[PDB]
Amino acid sequence: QESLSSWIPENIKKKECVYFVESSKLSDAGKVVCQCGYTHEQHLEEATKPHTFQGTQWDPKKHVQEMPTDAFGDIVFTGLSQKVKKYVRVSQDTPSSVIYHLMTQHWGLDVPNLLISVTGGAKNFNMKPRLKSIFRRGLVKVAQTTGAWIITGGSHTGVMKQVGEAVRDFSLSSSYKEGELITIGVATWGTVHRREGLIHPTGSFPAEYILDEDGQGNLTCLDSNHSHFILVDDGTHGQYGVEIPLRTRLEKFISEQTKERGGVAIKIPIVCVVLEGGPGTLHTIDNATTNGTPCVVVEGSGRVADVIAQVANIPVSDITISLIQQKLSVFFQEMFETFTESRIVEWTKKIQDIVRRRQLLTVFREGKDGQQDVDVAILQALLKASRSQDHFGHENWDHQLKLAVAWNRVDIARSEIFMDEWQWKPSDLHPTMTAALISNKPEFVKLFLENGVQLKEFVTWDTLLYLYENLDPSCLFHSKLQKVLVEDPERPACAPAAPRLQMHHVAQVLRELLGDFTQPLYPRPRHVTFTMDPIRDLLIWAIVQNRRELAGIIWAQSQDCIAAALACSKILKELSKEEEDTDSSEEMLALAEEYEHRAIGVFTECYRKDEERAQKLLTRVSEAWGKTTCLQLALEAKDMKFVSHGGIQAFLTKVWWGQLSVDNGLWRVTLCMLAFPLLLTGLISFREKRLQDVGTPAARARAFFTAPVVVFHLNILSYFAFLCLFAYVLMVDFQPVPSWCECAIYLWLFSLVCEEMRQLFYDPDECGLMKKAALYFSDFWNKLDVGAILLFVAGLTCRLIPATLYPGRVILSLDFILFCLRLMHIFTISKTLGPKIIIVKRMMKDVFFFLFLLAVWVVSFGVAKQAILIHNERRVDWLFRGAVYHSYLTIFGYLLFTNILLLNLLIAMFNYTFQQVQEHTDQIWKFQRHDLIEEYHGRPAAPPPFILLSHLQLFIKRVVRHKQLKNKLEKNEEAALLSWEIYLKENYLQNRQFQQKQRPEQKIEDISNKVDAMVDLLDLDGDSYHVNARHLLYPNCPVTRFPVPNEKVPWETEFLIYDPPFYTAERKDAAAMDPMGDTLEPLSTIQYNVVDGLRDRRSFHGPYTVQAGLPLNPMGRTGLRGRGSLSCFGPNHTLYPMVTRWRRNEDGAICRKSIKKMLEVLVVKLPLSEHWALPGGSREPGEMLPRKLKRILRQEHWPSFENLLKCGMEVYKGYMDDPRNTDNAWIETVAVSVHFQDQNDVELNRLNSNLHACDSGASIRWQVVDRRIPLYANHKTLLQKAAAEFGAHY
Amino acid sequence: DPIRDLLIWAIVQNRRELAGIIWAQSQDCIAAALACSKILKELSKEEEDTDSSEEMLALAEEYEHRAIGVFTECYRKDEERAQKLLTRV
Ligand SMILES: Nc1ncnc2c1nc(Br)n2[C@H](O)[C@H](O)[C@H](O)CCOP(=O)(O)OP(=O)(O)OC[C@@H]1O[C@@H](O)[C@@H](O)[C@@H]1O
């Protein structure tokens, strides 16, 4: 609103009538109306001055002045909706660039993918409800699902009133994006009812407007359902012909613009629709159709549109002028008598053209055939005309696909594009596949992947780099990627001005998210080159920015799908906690829980086909995911439902024992560990019976110390025996000379901390030392283990000086109590009491306050016990013992409060947090098992009493991870394992979809969807005369040629209205022929049917009719008589040479289409023409035509040789249809075709060396012969005739 | 606020379907949705009936959920600005 009010008045300007002509005609009791028609005695309301020289009368040029616009703002239509709609006020001469810039940037509109235009008559009309609902629904759907502009008129009467009505109908529901059907309106400012309440300079912000129908004259009121208005000025009061020219110019300039989103660029398609127009719609339809807009006329309730619908598929030129007159005399009752005999001619000619081209013209057929929702009909006509456009190199296919992907309708893609036009090698769909992936279009990616594009290909290094650059610019990954991009300093070292994206940048942040333990996925830098597993990277690109539907589609064809499915959950959980959101932070946390279930469901499929091979893939280092296993990812990703599957627990129980069998029990293990000579007999069990039957006595002894459960039992027994020994010395061995167990308690308490060196020091994955310390501090059990030494802190001095008996016993006794509390951790192994200790560790909290609930009142009643005794006494020492005894007696025995009031408080505080923990404790404990299992696997194989032998032996190895949970497999076997995994994943996905389609809700939805199409089903139930030479608007000539219908085109035919303007060339004198544009002076002396020297007067057609000294066109009356663009008065001779050879494959043989050969023809275009033409021109020299014909092509020396070789085959000679043909001058052509039989040598190499076209102009190029080859309309008729020369397929 | 008064007129005499339609376009819709429940609970205890006294006590529990569901929508778009409307006269 600040930079908008500035960019309006000093570039846009308004017309005004400065001069003061009085009123030639006074109308409707008004004298202020003067020609143009504003107020005041003068023509306008400006200063009443002589206004420079007082030249009589005014000229719309001399006396129209352009001054800056003063009216603009946000119109509000009183109480009829509060929406605030923009409006600007312009004039005739404003370039469309200014309006486009304003409308795109300042107004805030977005560039559309389609420009639908609504032009129609303004006489109010009323139409049947069926067609009415069809039009409304079709227009709204086609204009909402594509985000198209609906540019139309701004009046409140007619078709534009109908479209305002349809926009209101859309706003009635407005399921989402209510203010998205933006409809810019174009109307004349000079004819508005309440326009004086809008003229406010330097900002008419919310300028209220009042609409009142049946209160005007011929002027018009504004609409209320449009979104934007652009009003045009002319300094006129009652004219209606000023908005159409500017609208056509702007609408033409819009289609020139190109939209580039996702890597594919298209020029905006442009479509037109009409509904019962009047006299000016036969302007707009012609003006649109001649350009190439797919005009869509609707059959039904039509004054004009119904005329085209009626005369629509009846073939061209089969209609007579009288037939058109009788067609028109049955529909126009009001003015059937005011139709001039010349008004028929214009309509006949324009209907002739429009209905002649049926490729551009399209009739709706409201209910007969093709009676769809109108949206697909409009799109179908648009793609018809797009297919009809020029294309040389298979461009129609790619353009139509690009446009379909630009829109969001897959039905169009599959029913028009992907069904037809052949070919489409799967590599061809790659460029648009990138845009489909970038714009998040899952339907189109499914369709493309159906047609043959393989995800194994199309993921190149370049393509991946392109995709990461165009990542969604609203993502946490985008922000962090930008940060790492800018923070790397020796990357800008080469060029600090521009930051360059590379592959390692995404890899670093990916490692940051996924974990330290993995190596970077993409190696540091140090044609098409795929990386290993080209699907994992596309899977990352799809997962990171939270693309649900793309994610499953890409994961459906992954190499390894347990590791990938778990990494996808780890990344999501890591990136779903520091996002600072509540919508996507909740969406990703739920998508992670779904990839969790994907990983779980794929693995149980493998665990049911086999047992031993279902764990070798559980523990195998993956080279495509950071050199990590499938178990460490789940354990570190907090996957609570995967590590407690049962197939994971069996594998953990198996390593909990080792190489020995599990179906033995715990009692037998204790019996054997207690009795050392109890393993050589048949008591303990074994698996892998090769060592059980042939039992090695040496291996049997080593196996138990290898097993970790034996190590755990030795540790627990050693710790318990230590604790008993400490109790023993607490009892009786307490001598000032250190008892035989003082050094022993020191050393065997060091036995705990020396292993703590191993637990704390070891870092299987690269982790910081301070992180290690923080992790150690975060453990409350480790805090108790440290608190053992913490209560040592007061014990060593008490031992050193043993006199402090009374203070010092308590320190060591509480140290014993803390030792016993630490002993309680042993039950985590116990399956039945492990989770039970887990819940008790959360039970511990309630005691801290139930103690304040119990002890305080117990002590209070103990106080009352002494208060009962005696009142006043002074014995601090004695009352202490007395109160202690009383409290002890009360505790031992009070019954009213202990058993009744407190007990249920306790039981309830228990049971509240007991309830609802049955489900989660199992998962928690089965998760916590692995840490202890791995710790005891990493522990040494010696009892704590003796473990010093290994503590003194693990130093020489260092001076000069294990294969149980992480190992490398052999590649040949790994390939078979991966193929087995692929087969089982396919089976699992297939079963999953088959079983999910059977849900009752899905079945009900299927019935509901099936009944709707069925409800829809039940509810629904050539003359050969010249044509180009007869078009209106003679090229580059302001005067328009008089319309001549095909009925009276020949000279001999009856005709009575002949009045064409005398055609005048720009410079007829320099033609070197008769300059007589007007035949007043017959200076020309043309020797008819004879040679006249410099100017040829001999025609190939033959003796033509001559009258009044003006040569008559033999073909017929073109409609314009005069000098013409042709050089000479009368016929002009030319020759068009063509070089034709059979198009050849790599073998050199003639190439075949389905029908016949291909001809290869050389064509040349110059940039200014914007069309292709044969290298032929007017034969200025009589002796040597080719020199002037193709002087810019050959050499004139090489073309002297070409003239020596100029002896070929004569294809066509006779009259030519050319747009310059006036009634006086016409063009006749000679066609010579030189053909090449072999391509080894001769004239081909002669022309190759015979080239001087490099002097100037554009390129000279060979071409194929095709129906859509870009050439002039009838200049290619010569080539079409030449097709018969050598059996050509068109 | 020419809608709050029509909302009172619709709520007081227990007009279910009119009540939601009028509340759909209210200025402030946590305070209004809570006052509509307070009025209903106050006027649904001294009515001397069993049909409408039970209908209004259930309509109050529905404007309760309307007020709750509107506020969690504000509490998920922002954190600090979702309480400045919680405490504003
Ligand atoms: N908003 C208006 N626009 C054009 N005329 C209007 C308008 N309001 C009124 Br009041 N009238 C007058 O009526 C004209 O004098 C008509 O002659 C009268 C009968 O209406 P029609 O004859 O049925 O329709 P056309 O004359 O063919 O003009 C079609 C135009 O061309 C398209 O590009 C669009 O800009 C327009 O729709």
Ligand SMILES: Nc1ncnc2c1nc(Br)n2[C@H](O)[C@H](O)[C@H](O)CCOP(=O)(O)OP(=O)(O)OC[C@@H]1O[C@@H](O)[C@@H](O)[C@@H]1O
């Ligand atoms: N099949 C056609 N053959 C020749 N002209 C054609 C043809 N169809 C069209 Br429609 N035209 C019109 O001419 C275009 O509208 C141009 O505006 C006219 C010239 O402008 P250009 O396009 O730049 O030049 P050309 O068309 O390639 O050849 C013109 C040569 O040059 C002049 O001196 C003349 O003596 C020669 O005929």
